[PDB]
Each structure stands twice: as C-alpha cells, then as structure tokens.
Short mmCIF file of C-alpha atoms (C1' of nucleotides) and ligand atoms in Angstrom, two decimals:
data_model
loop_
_atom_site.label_atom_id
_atom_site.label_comp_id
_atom_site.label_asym_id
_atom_site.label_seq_id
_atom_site.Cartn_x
_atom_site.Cartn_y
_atom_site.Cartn_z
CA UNK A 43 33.42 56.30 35.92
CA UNK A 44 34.00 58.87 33.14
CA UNK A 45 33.07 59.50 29.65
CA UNK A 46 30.51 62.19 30.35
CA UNK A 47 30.74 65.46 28.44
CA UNK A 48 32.14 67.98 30.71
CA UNK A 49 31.21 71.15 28.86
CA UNK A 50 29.09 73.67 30.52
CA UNK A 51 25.89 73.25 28.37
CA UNK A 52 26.14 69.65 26.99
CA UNK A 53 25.33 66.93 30.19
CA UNK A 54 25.41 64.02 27.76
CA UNK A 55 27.04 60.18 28.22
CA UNK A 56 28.49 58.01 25.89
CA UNK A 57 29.93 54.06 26.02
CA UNK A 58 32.18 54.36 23.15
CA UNK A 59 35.25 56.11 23.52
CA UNK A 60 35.59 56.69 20.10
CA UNK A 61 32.42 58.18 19.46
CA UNK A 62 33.15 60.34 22.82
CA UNK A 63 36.52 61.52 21.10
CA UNK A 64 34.40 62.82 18.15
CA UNK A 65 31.59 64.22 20.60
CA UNK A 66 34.69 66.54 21.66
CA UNK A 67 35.99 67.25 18.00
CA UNK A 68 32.35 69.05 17.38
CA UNK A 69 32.92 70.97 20.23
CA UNK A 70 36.04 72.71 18.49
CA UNK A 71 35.50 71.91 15.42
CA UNK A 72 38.71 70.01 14.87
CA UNK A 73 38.54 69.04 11.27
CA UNK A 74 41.61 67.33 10.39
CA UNK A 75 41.14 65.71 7.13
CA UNK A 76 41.72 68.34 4.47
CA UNK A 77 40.18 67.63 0.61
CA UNK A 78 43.63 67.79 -1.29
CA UNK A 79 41.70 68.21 -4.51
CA UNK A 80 42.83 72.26 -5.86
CA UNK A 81 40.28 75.39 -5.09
CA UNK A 82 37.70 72.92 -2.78
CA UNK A 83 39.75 72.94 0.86
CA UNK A 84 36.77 71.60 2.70
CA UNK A 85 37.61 69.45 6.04
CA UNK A 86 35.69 66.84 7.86
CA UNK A 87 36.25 65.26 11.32
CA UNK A 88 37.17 62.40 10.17
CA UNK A 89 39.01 60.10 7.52
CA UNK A 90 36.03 58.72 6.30
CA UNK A 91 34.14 61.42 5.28
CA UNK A 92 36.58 62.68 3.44
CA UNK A 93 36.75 59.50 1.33
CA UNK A 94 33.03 59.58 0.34
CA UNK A 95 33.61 63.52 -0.41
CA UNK A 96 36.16 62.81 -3.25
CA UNK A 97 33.44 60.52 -4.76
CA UNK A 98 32.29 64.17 -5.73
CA UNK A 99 35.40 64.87 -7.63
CA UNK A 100 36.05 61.36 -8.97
CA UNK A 101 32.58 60.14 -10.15
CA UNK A 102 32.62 56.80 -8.56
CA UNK A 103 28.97 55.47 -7.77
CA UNK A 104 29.80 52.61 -6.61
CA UNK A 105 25.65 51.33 -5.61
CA UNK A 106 24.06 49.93 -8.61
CA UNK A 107 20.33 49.68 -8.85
CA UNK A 108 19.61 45.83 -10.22
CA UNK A 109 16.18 46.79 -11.59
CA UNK A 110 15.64 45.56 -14.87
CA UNK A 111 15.95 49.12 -16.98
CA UNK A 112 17.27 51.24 -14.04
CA UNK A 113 20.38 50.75 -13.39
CA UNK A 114 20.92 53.95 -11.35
CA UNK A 115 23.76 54.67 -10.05
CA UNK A 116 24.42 56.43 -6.36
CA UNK A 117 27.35 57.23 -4.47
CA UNK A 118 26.44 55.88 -0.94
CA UNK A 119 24.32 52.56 -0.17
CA UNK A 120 22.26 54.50 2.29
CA UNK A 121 20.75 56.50 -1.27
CA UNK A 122 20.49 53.46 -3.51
CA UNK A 123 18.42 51.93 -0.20
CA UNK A 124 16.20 55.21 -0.39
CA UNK A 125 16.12 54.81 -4.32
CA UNK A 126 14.52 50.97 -4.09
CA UNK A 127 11.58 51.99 -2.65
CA UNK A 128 10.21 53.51 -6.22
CA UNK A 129 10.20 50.55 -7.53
CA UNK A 130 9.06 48.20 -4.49
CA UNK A 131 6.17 50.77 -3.01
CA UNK A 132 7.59 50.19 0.64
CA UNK A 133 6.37 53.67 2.82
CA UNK A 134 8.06 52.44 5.77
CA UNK A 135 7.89 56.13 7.21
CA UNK A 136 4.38 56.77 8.72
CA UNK A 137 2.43 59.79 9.99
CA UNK A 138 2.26 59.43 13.43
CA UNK A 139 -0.53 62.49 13.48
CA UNK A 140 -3.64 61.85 15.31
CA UNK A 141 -5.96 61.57 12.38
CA UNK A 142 -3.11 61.58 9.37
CA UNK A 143 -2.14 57.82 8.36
CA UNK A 144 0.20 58.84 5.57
CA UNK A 145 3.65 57.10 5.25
CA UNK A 146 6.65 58.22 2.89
CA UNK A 147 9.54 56.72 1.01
CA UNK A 148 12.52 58.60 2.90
CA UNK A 149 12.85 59.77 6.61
CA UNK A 150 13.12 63.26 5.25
CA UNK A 151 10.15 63.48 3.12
CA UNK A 152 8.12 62.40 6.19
CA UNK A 153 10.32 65.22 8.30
CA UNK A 154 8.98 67.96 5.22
CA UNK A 155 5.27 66.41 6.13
CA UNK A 156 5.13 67.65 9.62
CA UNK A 157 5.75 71.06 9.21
CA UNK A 158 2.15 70.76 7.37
CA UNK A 159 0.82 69.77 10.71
CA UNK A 160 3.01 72.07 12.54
CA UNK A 161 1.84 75.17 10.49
CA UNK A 162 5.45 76.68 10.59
CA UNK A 163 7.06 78.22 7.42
CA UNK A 164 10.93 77.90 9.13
CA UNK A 165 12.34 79.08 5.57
CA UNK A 166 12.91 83.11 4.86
CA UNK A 167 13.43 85.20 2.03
CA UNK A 168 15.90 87.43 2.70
CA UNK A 169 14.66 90.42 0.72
CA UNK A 170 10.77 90.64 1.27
CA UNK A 171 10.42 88.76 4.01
CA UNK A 172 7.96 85.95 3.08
CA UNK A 173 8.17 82.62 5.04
CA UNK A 174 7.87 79.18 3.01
CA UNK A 175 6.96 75.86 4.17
CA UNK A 176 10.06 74.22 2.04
CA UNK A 177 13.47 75.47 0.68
CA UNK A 178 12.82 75.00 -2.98
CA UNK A 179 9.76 77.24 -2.72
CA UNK A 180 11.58 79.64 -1.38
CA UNK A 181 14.23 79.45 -4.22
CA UNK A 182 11.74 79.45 -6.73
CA UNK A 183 10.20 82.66 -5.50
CA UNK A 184 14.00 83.66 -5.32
CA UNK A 185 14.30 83.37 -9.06
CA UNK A 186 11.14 85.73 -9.44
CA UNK A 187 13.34 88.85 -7.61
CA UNK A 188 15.86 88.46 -9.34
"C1'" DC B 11 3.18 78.63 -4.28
"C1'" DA B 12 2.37 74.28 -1.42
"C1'" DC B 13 3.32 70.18 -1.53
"C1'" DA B 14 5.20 65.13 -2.28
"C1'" DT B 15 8.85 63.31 -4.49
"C1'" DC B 16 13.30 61.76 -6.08
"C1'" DC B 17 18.31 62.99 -5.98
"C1'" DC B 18 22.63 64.43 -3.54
"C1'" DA B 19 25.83 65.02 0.36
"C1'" DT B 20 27.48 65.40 5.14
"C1'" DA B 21 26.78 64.52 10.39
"C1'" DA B 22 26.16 61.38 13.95
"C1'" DT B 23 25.75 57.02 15.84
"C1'" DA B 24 27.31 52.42 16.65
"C1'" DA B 25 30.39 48.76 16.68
"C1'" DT B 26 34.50 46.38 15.17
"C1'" DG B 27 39.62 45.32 13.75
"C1'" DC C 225 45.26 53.40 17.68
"C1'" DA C 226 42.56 52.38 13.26
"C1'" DT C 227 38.28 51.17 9.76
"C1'" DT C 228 33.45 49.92 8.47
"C1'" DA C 229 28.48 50.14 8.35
"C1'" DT C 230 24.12 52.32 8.86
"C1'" DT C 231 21.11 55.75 10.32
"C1'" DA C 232 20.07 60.61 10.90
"C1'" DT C 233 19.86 64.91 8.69
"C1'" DG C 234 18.76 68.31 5.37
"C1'" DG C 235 19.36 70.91 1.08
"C1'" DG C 236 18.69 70.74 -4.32
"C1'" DA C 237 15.72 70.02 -8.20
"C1'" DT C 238 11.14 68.98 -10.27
"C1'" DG C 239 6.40 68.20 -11.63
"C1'" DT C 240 1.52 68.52 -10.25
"C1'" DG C 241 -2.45 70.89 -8.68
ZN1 LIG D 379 29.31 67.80 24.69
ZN1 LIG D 380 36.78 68.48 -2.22
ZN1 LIG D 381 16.21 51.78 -9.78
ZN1 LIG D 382 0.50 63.66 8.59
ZN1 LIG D 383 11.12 87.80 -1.66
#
DNA sequence: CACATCCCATAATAATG
DNA sequence: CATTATTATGGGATGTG
C-alpha cells in the first residue's frame, strides 16, 4: 500500500504514479530536459515544459482571440482563457473577505487583493529597506535609486 | 506609491494513450 | 513507458488616483 512520500519533512499521498515520480524529481531537482537553443541552458522536469519554453524562442502563439478587432495572440490556452474575460466581464474570482464582495478577472489578481486585507508588504528593496505591497512598486521605486 | 489590471511564463495537478 | 490538458502560481509592465 505505497505511494506515500517517504522524505523526512513531506508526509504527503498520491494515486498517480506518475505524478508521484515527479513529486520525487522536485525533491532533487532532476531536470532532464535541457533547452538546446545556444546561451539559454535552462531545464525543466519534464518534456513538456520544455516544448512550451521554445515557444519563447520560436514565436509561435498558437491561441487566437476570435473577437472581432482583437485578434490577440498568446502562447498557452490557459492565457487566451484569462484574456476573454476583457471582453465578456466574467469576475469569476471573488473576495471571500467578510465585508469585501469584490471579484477579479485572473486567480492572481484576486491573490494581489488579499495582501490588502492582510496588511503585509512581502516585497523588499534591497538597498533602503522599504517593504511594498506588489513587485512592480517595488521596481518602480527601484528605478528612482538608480 | 498603492492598487487593479492585462500580459507572460513555469510549476503542479490530473488523467490518459 | 509515454503524451495531453488544465489549473495553480507568480513575476513583468502599465495607467489611474
Ligand atoms: Zn515529498
Ligand atoms: Zn531556452
Ligand atoms: Zn481579445
Ligand atoms: Zn477583498
Ligand atoms: Zn530603496
């Protein structure tokens, strides 16, 4: 009755045994598919991320956006999916704050929304010290140092 | 500068051939 | 063994207030 992670910290169970065999690539970072393209040598744990990686040395967008005057282009369905929603208003992402209500576009917009809530600023600037609620702000002030 | 917002890319999960 | 599909994840870039 196996296909429980045996390292010391992890206690976790899985029904595939593929996705267990990747569970123990993370572990050691066994990254087997090398980018073949010259000066990039990134690696990924498996094939298929390394055939959506070249799309970023090839250009292929394969996911059209069929809106009359868009058509966008994006190189995984999963971004062309996000993408839609500009032009259909769905905010399937909601707020699950006590008093909030708000719903977002993408998962991760509503993930940058709860750090309002929170309070926390988890992004540093490495020189003065300051503490941002987003990455980009802290960029920004980034570009003011230097 | 704090946000929401739209764009880009990889990691993880899940199931199938 | 292998491939495919979709979600989860999170940074990059931007325009408003
Ligand atoms: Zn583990
Ligand atoms: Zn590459
Ligand atoms: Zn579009
Ligand atoms: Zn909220
Ligand atoms: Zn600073």
């Amino acid at each position: 009755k196996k296909l429980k992670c045996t390292v010391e910290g992890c206690d976790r169970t899985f029904v595939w045994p593929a996705h267990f065999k990747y569970h123990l690539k993370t572990h050691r970072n066994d990254r087997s598919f090398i980018c073949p393209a010259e000066g990039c040598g990134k690696s990924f744990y498996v094939l298929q991320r390394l055939k959506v990686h070249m799309r970023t040395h090839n250009g292929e967008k394969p996911f059209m956006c069929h809106e009359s005057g868009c058509g966008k282009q994006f190189t995984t369905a999963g971004n062309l999916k996000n993408h839609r929603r500009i032009h259909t208003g769905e905010k399937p992402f909601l707020c699950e704050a006590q008093g909030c209500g708000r719903s977002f576009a993408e998962y991760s917009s509503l993930r940058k929304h709860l750090v309002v809530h929170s309070g926390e600023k988890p992004h540093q600037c490495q020189v003065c010290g300051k503490t941002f609620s987003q990455s980009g702000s802290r960029n920004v002030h980034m570009r003011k140092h230097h």
